[PDB]
Symmetry: D2
Amino acid sequence: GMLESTKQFLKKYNINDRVLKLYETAMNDIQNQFKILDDIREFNQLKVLNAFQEERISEAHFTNSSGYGYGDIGRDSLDAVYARVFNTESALVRPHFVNGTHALGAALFGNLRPGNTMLSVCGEPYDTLHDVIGITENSNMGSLKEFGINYKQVDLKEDGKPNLEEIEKVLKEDESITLVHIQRSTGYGWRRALLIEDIKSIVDCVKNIRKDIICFVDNCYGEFMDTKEPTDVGADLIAGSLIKNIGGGIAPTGGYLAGTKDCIEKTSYRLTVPGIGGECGSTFGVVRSMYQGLFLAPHISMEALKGAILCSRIMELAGFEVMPKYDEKRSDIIQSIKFNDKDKLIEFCKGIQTGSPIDSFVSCEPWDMPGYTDQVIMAAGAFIQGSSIELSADAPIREPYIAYLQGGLTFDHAKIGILIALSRIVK
Amino acid sequence: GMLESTKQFLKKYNINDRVLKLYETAMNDIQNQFKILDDIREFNQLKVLNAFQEERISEAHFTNSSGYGYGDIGRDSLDAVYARVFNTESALVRPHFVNGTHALGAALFGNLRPGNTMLSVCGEPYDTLHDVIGITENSNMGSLKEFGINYKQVDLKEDGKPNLEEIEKVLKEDESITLVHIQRSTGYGWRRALLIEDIKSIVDCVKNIRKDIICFVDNCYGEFMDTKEPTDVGADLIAGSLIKNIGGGIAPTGGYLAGTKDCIEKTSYRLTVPGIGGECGSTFGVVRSMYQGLFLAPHISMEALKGAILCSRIMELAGFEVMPKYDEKRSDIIQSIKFNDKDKLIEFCKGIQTGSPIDSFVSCEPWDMPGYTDQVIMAAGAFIQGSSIELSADAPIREPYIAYLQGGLTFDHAKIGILIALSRIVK
Amino acid sequence: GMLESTKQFLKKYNINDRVLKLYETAMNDIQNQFKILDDIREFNQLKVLNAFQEERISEAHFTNSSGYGYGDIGRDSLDAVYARVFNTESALVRPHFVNGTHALGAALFGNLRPGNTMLSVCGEPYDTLHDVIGITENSNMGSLKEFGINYKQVDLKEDGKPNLEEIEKVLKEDESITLVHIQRSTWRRALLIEDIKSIVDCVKNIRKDIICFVDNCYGEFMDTKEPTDVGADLIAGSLIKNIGGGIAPTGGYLAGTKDCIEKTSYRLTVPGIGGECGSTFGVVRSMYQGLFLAPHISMEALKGAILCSRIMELAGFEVMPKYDEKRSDIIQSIKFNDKDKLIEFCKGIQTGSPIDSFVSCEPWDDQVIMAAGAFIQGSSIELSADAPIREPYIAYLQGGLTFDHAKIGILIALSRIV
Amino acid sequence: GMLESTKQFLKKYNINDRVLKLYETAMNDIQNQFKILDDIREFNQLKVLNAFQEERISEAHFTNSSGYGYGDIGRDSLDAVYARVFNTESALVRPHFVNGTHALGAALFGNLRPGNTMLSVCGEPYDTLHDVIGITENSNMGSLKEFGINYKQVDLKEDGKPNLEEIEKVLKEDESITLVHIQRSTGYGWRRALLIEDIKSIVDCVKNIRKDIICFVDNCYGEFMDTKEPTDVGADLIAGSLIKNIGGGIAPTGGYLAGTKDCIEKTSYRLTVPGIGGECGSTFGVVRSMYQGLFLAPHISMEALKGAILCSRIMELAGFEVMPKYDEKRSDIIQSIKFNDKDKLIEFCKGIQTGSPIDSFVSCEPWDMTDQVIMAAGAFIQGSSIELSADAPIREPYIAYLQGGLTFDHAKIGILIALSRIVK
């Protein structure tokens, strides 16, 4: 078990016996869940490895392109590797995407035209996607609604599963709907994340009514959570962020997209412009960090998930409501905790920040973040700015006072942050 | 005068006395015009220096942001410096623009909504912008025509200056026109250059009919060509590429935009997505090269211009029609050369290619463009791939075989390149 | 347990049930040894984390670094973070070291003046360090012998432990010896932390002014302690190994007393400047990030070496170190007693590599064959293998960014034997 | 001539009519000198352009190596390009060199062994090179003297030219002398520059007594200053800094060495260690800036030199003694100005700092490191001497040393801003 040197070192951070004993109890109760993740990870490592070996990757693929970047073998082979990993025709892996929202927004504006209608089957989508769609306060910024692209919505059932009966009615009753949006990660809510098994039901259901409907899945945080991905259950196009899971903590920035050749090309013309698409775009000498990041993604993703499981159990034992539980199948690295107390929520976040490698001394304060309606606090003591694959904790300041912990480059680091944070709220 | 050891060295490149004496006559005739560029350059150097100083630029501004890039002082202050240089409210300089076309498109999509008409007042815009507007094919890529944005056009008069009479009639007859497009650079045309004086006429004219119209100006190849810029004569928004003039030969990639805060913000929502705009976007640690590139821009631009002026005169004394002439006011760094022969055009390009630092050995033959009928021969060999500010040439194979030389980091390099090319035709 | 989909996927790499059944047994046997590594790793991750926090590392430390690099906060703080991790006074972490041999040699030339004798207490040192010292066959390159710095040697005892009796006789009978060279990495038992202390106390007792230098390659984060925690005056190592965590693109490091580190920097640079100049080339974040992942990534390679040791013993080969032995490095050796089995093994490791999988793996030019396919060129922290072709045909496997990757490459290689 | 807008803009920087009129005269006088620089630059651009072409450089040479970096074609072809530029057998151009001093130090430790003697024929060498050699102070840092390598010195004559008669006698009397150090740049001495013509005289002289002697020349600031380089007049080895002339204001860091294969190989073993040498070493993806910097070096070097010529003339007309003069043949881009007043020296440096693109707001003042010094530094590349900058130790007769200017226009904008704080 934990060495006596380690115990004594933790005392410097004021990690009391209550928290340390509470940690050891949690660590025992969650050991069986860990071995299920390792044999999943094993497949994913071989899945990525195979993708490299088929595309015939070499030292020559770590390009330092400049200008237009015509004939960039590193950039093109990286797209091909992603296509093989997600088992899709094409893929658009680029550092030019400022964040995950840009990648998601690119897919929508790329695959939607004036007259077409959109349909989010998992209720209100990620809060930063509202202005892109133009659901609420529609300013003259150039949203989907402002370009004649309509938006309908169907919420999930009370239990959390997708309301298939209602999805069929809406599609049948509105033939203009050409794209169906499927958010995988729960986001800032209180429900369990949709499994691959849950996505297959939504895809089979909508594809049965009309086969030409595009199934777009917001795949952030769900990378390598299961042996299969949404693209392996009929998903026409997915999208995500390189500073999260798939980047493995190495990827400096960017986003990715994987799907049918037509869906990816249409998305590339939004990223750039019609006629160019993905033809131009230098990699800024960071292509190797993206390759190596993908290779470590299956491993790093599970380290953060293990920290998420530990967090769930230790916090439950402490007496706080947790979502998801330690023994439930997880479709993402996010671990939400409901404190029902504002003091405890901020102290917990400040504790995660203080247990980080970068900007430890910096104190977390609710920040008026872009895209989010309410003022959201975040604990982002990371090498790469705002990475959620690295240990981090954020929460919108609103009742119920729910904190959202995720990440951990190594399980040991994630673990330490949890002990430091928990000690700061319970003496 | 040229040293005896220099012209002896030049003989190794098959440079003959006929071309060499023809050079000495041209070099003497353009001395007065070179003096005019020097004092214009003198102002632009001080105009750029002042921009840095007013923004208190420091080594702290050479950032190396990652992930989102919130608070990237380098990025933000570089935008501020561009705003000062071009005397505009705001600016949007990013390494994320794959090329100049991306920048120009970003402005169009960002400032045009369904129902709005567009109007090019300098005739047909350059080839790779047709797909963005949707003039030629419009094959479901997401062109302006496919988003309900119409395109209109008014050609230039016989003399080369804008047809202001027809511009008024077109604006008066169609109130839907909210944006007017102005291409400063000549491109593949045999006409007099469009000067700032001429641009002021276009703005004053269209702004007189209806002030709410946006006067967008394609500023490619025209940066620091005159003490004033289009933004100094009322232009609401301008756009260009960083691998041309303004990058000063150092800029690795990217593009820029400068204008009113409204146009820039609206353009940024196309670059990324509505709700984010330019609030995110890491600079990959290449912001220093963009600052230094700008600082060297006024100087490097005139090295290329001086090379074009020398090219114009020496080729005119050689018996070939040239456009523009050596002593005409210029809008861009391009120089056209009408050979009236396929072989003379081919030999000149091969000569330019053979006088380049990178890829001199490479075979320079004509090749077939993927979406055009006529073949194209091109002379390219730069540090930054496809940089136009570096010595380069291009020409479509068709009567009367007009070549387009452009760029040169140092006038000497342009001079050496021209002498190698002309000595290959004139024995 | 391995999913049905995984073993069906592995069939594509010719992996049979002989090897797969042999693996299950090998995996079950080494679980207790893996648990000992996990809690050793737990302390090291905390040790590195505390080093960053005490030094107040921030986003500002990853800023631009050009020219001379005077007052480079990113560089100086990285040295300070290393000094804390190794509990030393100062440190010299620079990306300018071409490799480990540069770092090790920089320490020797830095702390040796004409007349001084050197003493390797672990037999002949690393093969590439012979010309640096100028032991034999000297051309005018500027070796230690050519600058008037002498060299002596003392081999290890037959059992593997250091000969403390012979070390005393040599130091007592030769007062010119001012430095003791202690190579940590290892066909024999690896030199552990406790053994290193036994060598330091033995030499420091006779004459305290003697500087104990320890070549710490591959030994980073193998134990909760380091050579510097047991009285070592200075250590050196390559950043493309254990301590770089697979991310560090190049460089080397040094950690020890302020006098030894400053004296070493004047060789790296020149007397008068030393470490005062040297920009980080915009790759300092990877050196920090690499150090943070080092404790974790190092044990992935070690776990792969433990699996490699057990699975080959069960397969019918002589292995060294054995699966249940305390380790001083991530290296795992395998005696084959056959030329084809050795070649086929490396042939297979090359196939299991992410980079250059397709590339041919045959003996270069006695004679040697190598399996390399890493993101960083020649980084032994990533799955690699090398072996000289000569009886009993011993192989040397090292690395693996993740245990799953090491496991796969090791599994593919054995599948060619059976 | 200068436009009304330009001079109306300069008035915002407090530039008076006296200074501006003084500039017009100075600019008129130095016209012919600028033409002499333009026809030297022309040859240098062609010399470099050819080197790239002879080496068959391409987009594949902009490598991004890692780890050891074996087979790094970009690094090897860069050396070969430099070798062709300097007409030498071998070359060693690396970003690994912390600075020019480290390049020089590597050359000395690399070619000298215990028992050998070193000889500087240009007097006392560059101040920071003392600790490397171990001339005066010898703390146990590992100087040349501390590794049994001796040092001797022969000063220049009163006129500034090398004392050839003493050089001969000194070499004949001590056969242990195997290396002859030669500093090209004038440094901080108020004397005439050492030309390639004068460097040839030193080589021919020392080689006649004993051809075995290695002629080493510290080539800092002399790159592309003339059509011929020290290696073209018999120099066995040379060394310089990439953040000075030869990097064209683009090279981020590093240093170079050009000379015989035996010299360059021996030096690389000091840079690294014996056995490895230059065989290992990743270029950090900055090899493009080094190529590109070399290609702009011939042009950028003369932009700084022209600013120095302009400085020398306008300051002479302003009533201050200068060195070198505007019409003299130069060996470096450094221009010294005698003020005979503490305030006038300080105000001049403050104005240059004001005219910098970076750290313009940073008010420079006296600071100690023998006695106090004031420095004007504001560059993109930290401490780049090719960018406009100035330094001056605070003591009589108060001499300032101005260097650099990426473009001549920027150089003159800094000078006019500085001179306007001192005169009328």
